[PDB]
């Protein structure tokens, strides 16, 4: 066996089409997969204090809004996750929840996220299935409840195993306080309810004048 | 990047300090108006310039 120096030369430039056909799909694949590398593996491998104000906090958190209370957004596919995550700006804070049906703790914090999104309009609360996310099956056993927070492409929240840190019956107040004391939840602002709406648009600047 | 084009078109000389801002460094123009493009946007035109 001789002629080790091959210099395939014309071959690769005559087969660019098919190689690039594989390459684009592979690029999508590891872009999607590396978008979740930074969470996987290493997480799983690793009398004012009596909250008198907690009850009244729940009391005026009950009054969500007028027009219903919506729900928490659900991601259909990993490609959908990527194409909803690369958009928007840095100022938008995103919290994502991985979950499965039937397991304890999901419903309580799901309702917590619902009411938080009701009274935190700025944030982009959303939830995604563990099967959809395609994470390692080690997550599929022992890492389901994971209050994952993203901010414009980089991690700002590093919270997994939230059941241990909050419980199973923890309400909106508990998770809200836990998130804000880490400096994640933006400061709330006094927001009132108008009649329904005022701003149809603002595009044309033909408003008024009194020329003689 | 448009400073050279504006100065060539009108005749104004750029002023970088208020001390040298004098009347001789101003470009005269007959009309400088902002027109409406039938609701498609606002366009600003300076039509008619001394020493074009």
């Amino acid at each position: 066996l001789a002629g080790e120096g091959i210099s395939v030369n014309t071959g690769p430039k005559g087969v660019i089409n098919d190689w690039r056909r594989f390459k684009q799909l592979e690029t999508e694949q590891r872009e999607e997969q590396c978008r979740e590398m930074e969470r996987l593996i290493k997480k799983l491998s690793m009398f004012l204090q009596q909250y008198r104000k907690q009850r009244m906090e729940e009391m005026r958190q009950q009054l969500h809004k007028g027009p219903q209370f919506k729900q928490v957004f659900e991601i259909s596919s990993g490609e959908g996750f990527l194409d909803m995550i690369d958009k928007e700006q840095k100022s938008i804070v995103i919290m994502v929840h991985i979950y499965e049906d039937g397991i304890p703790g999901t419903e309580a914090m799901n309702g917590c996220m619902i009411c938080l999104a009701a009274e935190y309009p700025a944030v982009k609360f959303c939830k995604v299935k563990s099967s959809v996310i395609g994470a390692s099956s080690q997550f599929t056993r022992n890492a389901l409840p994971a209050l994952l927070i993203y901010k414009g492409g980089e991690l700002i929240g590093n919270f997994v195993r939230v059941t241990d840190q909050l419980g199973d019956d923890f309400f909106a107040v508990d998770l809200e306080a836990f998130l804000q004391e880490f400096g994640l939840l933006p400061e709330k602002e006094v927001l009132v309810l108008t009649s329904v709406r005022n701003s149809a648009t603002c595009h044309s600047e033909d408003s008024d004048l009194e020329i003689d | 990047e448009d400073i050279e084009f504006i100065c060539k078109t009108i005749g104004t000389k750029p002023v970088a300090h208020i001390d040298q801002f004098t009347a001789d460094m101003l470009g005269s123009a007959e009309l400088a108006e902002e027109v409406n493009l039938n609701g498609s946007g606002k366009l600003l035109k300076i039509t008619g310039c001394a020493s074009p």
């Binding site: 009649s195 149809a200 595009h203 004048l209 009194e210 | 498609s40």
Partner: protein, 532 residues
């Protein structure tokens, strides 16, 4: 051979694909044309609901992939922006033009000849419309405006209540009338603040002889009604004066810290006292007002409104005669606030509108303004009323600016089709086919109107064409140019005497835009879609 990383379509395949995309876009909204058209309604992925009839809104809400379909969607958006009405008819006409042009091309007629024929047909159609089919509104009076508004609001959620909505629209438009240099009256629509609020029925919609703010007083202490309002408009916040970034406070003698802290708010106190000493009663600012300044206004028995929208404040200042103030600095280098810059109004109240409150500035002096409060059954209905109301306002503006109107119900389309079919024989050898196809494609509007009413489209269009042909061939029966379509009974009708009008600019602009879009799409005969 090409070795291009992508997909390529050439010849009749790409032309058929473009025609398919255009036809799909047309058929999306073809069911929402004419008084018998029925509204659509769209649900987003999150769950938002939008019930609408406007073609431009429907095409904006939809997410579209094919480039030609995007071209038609942007064409509808352009027609909405530059005219305000006819956003569906333009799309339908453009798609029909593209379909007929491609049918001609498939017969080995060169696309350049078809494009030239379309260009000549459009020019002659515009000329014929401007020369024969226009009706001056000088002799019609206010009834012309009422009929134009009613025609515009037909097929909308406020169609049946047109008898009242047209009156409201015309009054609102006439309220904001102003004349500029060159002595040309101008009607700045979009200066009429449209406010929505669910509650009472449609007939309880209110036209405000003044201005309406979707804002409330900052504190419950101030009165909610002032009779002789002295409006003061400010473009700055009223808070504790924090020094700028370049200024730093360093204290070496402790005895001056209290004086510094006191002055830090005494500055704002002095500014508010200067503002109030002139007799002002209502104070509107785009910036924020904190508790101290709110209390200062409360003690003086005035009104303070914070976070007022900039456009709303500009409209209020222009109407009431007030002047916007960024700072209280005069040409002498000190702090002053003269009374000459105070606005005036005959009453300022905070009305309650369905468990919510808004500020009404009624009967402003030195200029008359207007605003409309729409009451509906729910939010979606109010949004649809707002869209239809905007369409009617734009139509009335076009009618009042250019005093030419044309009969509705497809009369213009039938007349143009007959005239172009006659005229094509006198031009060229292969351009005549293109002009005839232009005339045929112009007939899609009456056909769609007849179809949407479940009437016999063929017989109705045949009768319309016969009437218009007899009008054009008989010089003593020119009065038949106004024969349109009566969709209620499915019979031809003299639309000019039936009060079915619309601005000529609508037809002209729609024709030009559709022709240019069809020309743009027709030029393509090859597609290279590079793979991402």
């Amino acid at each position: 051979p090409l070795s291009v990383f992508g997909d390529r379509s050439t010849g009749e395949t790409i032309r058929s694909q473009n025609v398919m995309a255009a036809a799909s876009i047309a058929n999306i909204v073809k069911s929402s044309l004419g008084p018998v058209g029925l509204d659509k309604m769209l649900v987003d992925d999150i769950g938002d609901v939008t019930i609408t009839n406007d073609g431009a809104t429907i095409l904006k809400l939809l997410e579209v992939e094919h480039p030609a379909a995007k071209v038609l969607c942007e064409l509808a958006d352009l027609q909405d922006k530059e005219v305000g009405d006819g956003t569906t008819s333009v799309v339908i006409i453009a798609a029909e033009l593209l379909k007929n042009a491609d049918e001609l091309v498939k017969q080995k007629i060169h696309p350049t000849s078809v494009i030239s024929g379309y260009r000549l047909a459009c020019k002659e159609a515009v000329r014929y419309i401007n020369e024969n089919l226009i009706v001056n509104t000088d002799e019609l009076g206010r009834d012309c405006l009422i009929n134009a508004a009613k025609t515009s609001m037909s097929s909308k959620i406020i169609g049946i209540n047109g008898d009242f909505f047209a009156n409201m629209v015309v009054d609102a438009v006439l309220a904001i009338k102003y004349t500029d240099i060159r002595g040309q009256p101008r009607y700045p629509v979009n200066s009429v603040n449209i406010l929505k609020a669910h509650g009472r029925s449609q007939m309880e919609s209110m036209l405000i002889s003044g201005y309406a703010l979707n804002c409330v007083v900052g504190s419950q202490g101030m009165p909610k009604r002032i009779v002789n309002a002295k409006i003061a408009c400010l473009d700055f916040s009223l808070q504790k004066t924090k020094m700028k970034l370049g200024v730093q406070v360093v204290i070496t003698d402790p005895e001056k810290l209290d004086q510094i802290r006191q002055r830090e708010s005494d500055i704002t106190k002095e500014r508010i006292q200067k503002i109030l000493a002139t007799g002002a009663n209502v104070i509107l600012t785009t910036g924020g007002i904190d508790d101290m300044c709110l209390k200062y206004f409360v003690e003086a028995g005035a009104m303070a409104v914070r976070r007022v929208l900039k456009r709303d404040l500009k409209r209020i200042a222009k109407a009431s005669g007030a002047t916007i103030l960024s700072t209280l600095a005069n040409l002498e280098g000190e702090e002053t606030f003269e009374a000459a810059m105070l606005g005036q109004a005959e009453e300022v109240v905070q009305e309650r509108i369905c468990d919510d409150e808004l500020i009404l500035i009624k009967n402003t002096k030195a200029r008359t303004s207007a605003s409309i409060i729409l009451r509906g059954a729910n939010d979606f209905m109010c949004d649809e009323m707002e869209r239809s109301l905007h369409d009617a306002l734009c139509v009335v503006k076009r009618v009042l600016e250019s005093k030419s109107v044309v009969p509705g119900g497809g009369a213009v389309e039938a007349a143009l089709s007959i005239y172009l079919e006659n005229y094509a024989t006198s031009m060229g050898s292969r351009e005549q086919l293109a002009i005839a196809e232009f005339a045929r494609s112009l007939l899609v509007i009456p056909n769609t109107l007849a179809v949407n009413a479940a009437q016999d489209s063929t017989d109705l269009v045949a009768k319309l064409r016969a009437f218009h042909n007899e009008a054009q061939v008989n010089p003593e029966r020119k009065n038949l140019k106004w024969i349109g379509l009566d969709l209620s009974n499915g019979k031809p009708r003299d639309n000019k005497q039936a009060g079915v009008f619309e601005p000529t600019i609508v037809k002209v602009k729609s024709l030009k835009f559709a022709t240019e879009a069809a020309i743009t799409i027709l030029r393509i005969d090859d597609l290279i879609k590079l793979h991402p």
